[PDB]
Amino acid sequence: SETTERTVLGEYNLFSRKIEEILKQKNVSYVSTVSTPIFSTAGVQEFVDGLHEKLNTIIIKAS
Amino acid sequence: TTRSKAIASKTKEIEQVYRQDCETFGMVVKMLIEKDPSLEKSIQFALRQNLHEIGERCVEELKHFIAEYDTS
Amino acid sequence: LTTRSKAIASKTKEIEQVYRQDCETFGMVVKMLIEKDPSLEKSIQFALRQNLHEIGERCVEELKHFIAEYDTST
């Protein structure tokens, strides 16, 4: 159940190493410092509309 | 030289964007799996292809920044 | 209108913006997942619906919490 995290971090590592190969190759420059990713604090309009109605209902009941 | 600053700046930008794409894909996929556990293994292929291809476009984006910059 | 009506209305608007953001993000990610492995279309869609529903309900709970807090301490 860390498979997804392990996957995403592995992708990010491969990416940042390829970024470093490019920077070194052409040419020089220095060390990046973006932290590694972290995971903690079709039509979708039907869900938006459903929410909008439940909330209007609540509001009305509230007065 | 003088340019070193500019390249480093765009590289930080791109890394930040890619890092975000990563955090988002993983959060969504974890929640999908939370609801449907049989996805945990099989979804990895689609996650990995997406993140690999996005990675390359980001990489490509940096190269075409270098090449354009060094044109004069 | 009342301070309190305005507070509820704004809280509602904020929750809806956050929810819209989450729905569009879920939908974007799932669309790319399915483009890459279409055999997953049905189960991913299902899990999508589950998530958007549960988050929907939490939004509803959030608004009730706000009203209840406001009407017990103002």
Residue numbers in the entry:
A (entry chain C): 1014 to 1054, 1072 to 1093
B (entry chain A): 295 to 366
C (entry chain B): 294 to 367
Paper text:
Among the most important sources of epigenetic silencing in humans is the Human Silencing Hub (HUSH) complex, consisting of three proteins: Periphilin, TASOR and MPP8 (11). In the current model of HUSH-dependent repression HUSH spreads histone H3 lysine 9 trimethylation (H3K9me3), a transcriptionally repressive mark, by recruiting the H3K9 methyltransferase SETDB1 and its stabilizing factor ATF7IP to existing H3K9me3 marks via MPP8, which binds both H3K9me3 and ATF7IP. Here, we report the crystal structure of a Periphilin-TASOR minimal core complex and identify the key physicochemical properties of Periphilin necessary for HUSH complex assembly and epigenetic silencing. The Periphilin C-terminal region directs HUSH complex assembly by dimerizing and binding a single TASOR molecule through α-helical coiled-coil interactions.
Thus, a crystal structure of a Periphilin fragment spanning residues 292–367 bound to a TASOR fragment spanning residues 1014–1095 was determined using the single anomalous dispersion (SAD) phasing method, with bromine as the anomalous scatterer. The structure contains two Periphilin molecules and a single TASOR molecule. The Periphilin fragments form helical hairpins with a mixture of α-helix and 310-helix secondary structure. The two Periphilin hairpins pack against each other via a 118 Å2 hydrophobic interface formed by the hydrophobic side chains of Leu326, Leu333 and Ile337. The resulting Periphilin homodimer has twofold symmetry. The TASOR molecule forms two α-helices that wrap around the outer surfaces of the Periphilin dimer. The TASOR helices add a third helix to each Periphilin helical hairpin to form two three-helix coiled-coils. Unusually, however, each Periphilin subunit binds to a different TASOR sequence (residues 1014–1052 and 1072–1093, respectively) with an identical binding surface. Notably residues 1055–1071 of TASOR, between the two Periphilin-binding segments, are disordered, but these 17 residues could easily span the 35–40 Å trajectory needed to connect residues 1054 and 1072 in the Periphilin-TASOR complex. The 2:1 stoichiometry of the Periphilin-TASOR core complex was confirmed in solution by size-exclusion chromatography coupled with multiangle light scattering (SEC-MALS) and non-denaturing mass spectrometry.
